[PDB]
Enzyme design. Structure first.
Site, short mmCIF file in Angstrom:
data_model
loop_
_atom_site.label_atom_id
_atom_site.label_comp_id
_atom_site.label_asym_id
_atom_site.label_seq_id
_atom_site.Cartn_x
_atom_site.Cartn_y
_atom_site.Cartn_z
N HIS A 45 0.84 -1.24 0.00
CA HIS A 45 0.00 0.00 0.00
C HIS A 45 0.85 1.26 0.00
CE1 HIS A 45 -2.57 -3.02 2.18
NE2 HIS A 45 -3.13 -2.83 1.00
N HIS B 117 5.19 7.03 6.63
CA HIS B 117 5.00 6.59 5.29
C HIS B 117 4.50 7.76 4.45
CE1 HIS B 117 1.05 6.28 7.15
NE2 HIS B 117 0.60 6.73 5.98
N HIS C 208 2.05 9.06 0.80
CA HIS C 208 1.10 8.82 -0.27
C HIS C 208 1.53 9.72 -1.43
CE1 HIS C 208 -1.66 6.99 2.69
NE2 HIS C 208 -1.08 7.83 3.50
N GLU D 195 -3.31 13.46 0.29
CA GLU D 195 -4.60 13.02 0.84
C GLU D 195 -5.39 14.27 1.26
OE1 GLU D 195 -3.86 9.59 3.42
OE2 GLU D 195 -4.51 8.54 1.59
N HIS E 162 3.13 11.09 6.35
CA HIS E 162 2.42 10.83 7.58
C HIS E 162 3.36 10.24 8.62
CE1 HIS E 162 -1.64 10.60 5.35
NE2 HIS E 162 -1.23 11.85 5.57
N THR F 5 -6.47 6.80 7.18
CA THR F 5 -6.88 7.00 5.81
C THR F 5 -6.84 5.75 4.98
OG1 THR F 5 -4.74 7.64 4.90
CG2 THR F 5 -6.16 9.41 5.84
N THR F 6 -6.48 4.61 5.60
CA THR F 6 -6.57 3.28 4.97
C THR F 6 -7.37 2.43 5.90
OG1 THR F 6 -4.44 2.68 6.02
CG2 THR F 6 -4.40 3.38 3.77
C1 LIG Z 1 -3.53 0.66 9.12
C2 LIG Z 1 -2.81 1.89 9.56
C3 LIG Z 1 -1.78 1.83 10.47
C4 LIG Z 1 -1.16 2.99 10.89
C5 LIG Z 1 -1.51 4.23 10.41
C6 LIG Z 1 -2.56 4.30 9.53
N1 LIG Z 1 -2.94 5.54 9.03
O1 LIG Z 1 -2.40 6.66 9.26
O2 LIG Z 1 -3.98 5.63 8.09
C7 LIG Z 1 -3.17 3.13 9.10
ZN LIG Z 2 -1.02 7.77 5.53
#
Ligand SMILES: Cc1cccc([N+](=O)[O-])c1
Ligand SMILES: [Zn+2]
Length: 257
Positions: free
Chosen positions: A61, A91, A93, A103, A116, A195-196
């Site tokens: 992802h 991470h 996007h 995002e 993020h 956001t996931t």
């Molecule tokens: C599944 C997951 C794990 C850590 C952070 C997020 N996020 O920021 O959307 C999502």
């Molecule tokens: Zn993110």
């Protein structure tokens, strides 16, 4: 399972994760004209001098740079927050082109990418417990624009060849996330979600106003990553962003005038 294609992208997630249509989903568009300055907000305290990066992972992802979160070594405090939040991973996007990828949006402007930095509230003991709480996480979001290179990003970029496909990891020690921050820590804040999937409504968002600049070459390397696993049909990891969701009954607050 879920992803960012036509058949499995954001617009489908609600079928497996009905909270996708919830009251506090992220990201959102930041309307700079209606975000009100809140003089009661504090400066953000980003304390990353003792951060201990461990590994970088392609999870199918995005890629995560993971930290040792077994003690208070890299913590976020202050700002809108009560208490202490420990850095677990960061991470990004990003887009297929420089005109999309973020995002959050700012007055409907999309940035090329968004970083993020994910932190969990130490009062809940572990990440998994924290994501079950409305104040469980604090995510620091930083926009990326394409211009000058970000020197502090290059170590990340150069390891990406070694984690091209889903499930690959590499050692990634001694990386300093301070090198990914802009000069100013002015921010907007609002209550939202991951956001996931699973899209849990556990996040205090802190979105910095000032973007960082990365070079075209840097972002091009993000776009060489793959969503697929080794020796599967190659599908470039691009456009791994969720679009803006309805603000509903939220206010976005500004730390600055
Ligand atoms: C599944 C997951 C794990 C850590 C952070 C997020 N996020 O920021 O959307 C999502
Ligand atoms: Zn993110």
């Amino acid at each position: 399972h879920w992803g960012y294609g036509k058949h499995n992208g954001p617009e489908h997630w609600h079928k497996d994760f009905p909270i996708a249509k919830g009251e506090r989903q992220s990201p959102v568009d930041i309307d700079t004209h209606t975000a009100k300055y809140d003089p009661s907000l504090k400066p953000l305290s980003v304390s990353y001098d003792q951060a201990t990066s461990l590994r970088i992972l392609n999870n199918g992802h995005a890629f995560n740079v993971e930290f040792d979160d077994s003690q208070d070594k890299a913590v976020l405090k202050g700002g809108p927050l009560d208490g202490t939040y420990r850095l677990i991973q960061f991470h990004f996007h990003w887009g297929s082109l420089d005109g999309q990828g973020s995002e959050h949006t700012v007055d409907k402007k999309k940035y090329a990418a968004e970083l993020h930095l994910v932190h969990w509230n130490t009062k809940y003991g572990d990440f998994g417990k924290a994501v079950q709480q409305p104040d469980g996480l604090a995510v620091l979001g930083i926009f990326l624009k394409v211009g000058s290179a970000k020197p502090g990003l290059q170590k990340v970029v150069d390891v990406l060849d070694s984690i091209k496909t889903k499930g690959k990891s590499a050692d990634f020690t001694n990386f300093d996330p301070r090198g990914l921050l802009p000069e100013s820590l002015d921010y907007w804040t609002y209550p939202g979600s991951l956001t996931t999937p699973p899209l849990l409504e556990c996040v205090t968002w802190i979105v910095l106003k000032e973007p960082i600049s990365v070079s075209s070459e840097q972002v091009l390397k993000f776009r060489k990553l793959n969503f697929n696993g080794e020796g599967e049909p190659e599908e470039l990891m691009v456009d791994n962003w969720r679009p803006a969701q309805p603000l509903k009954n939220r206010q976005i607050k500004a730390s600055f005038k």
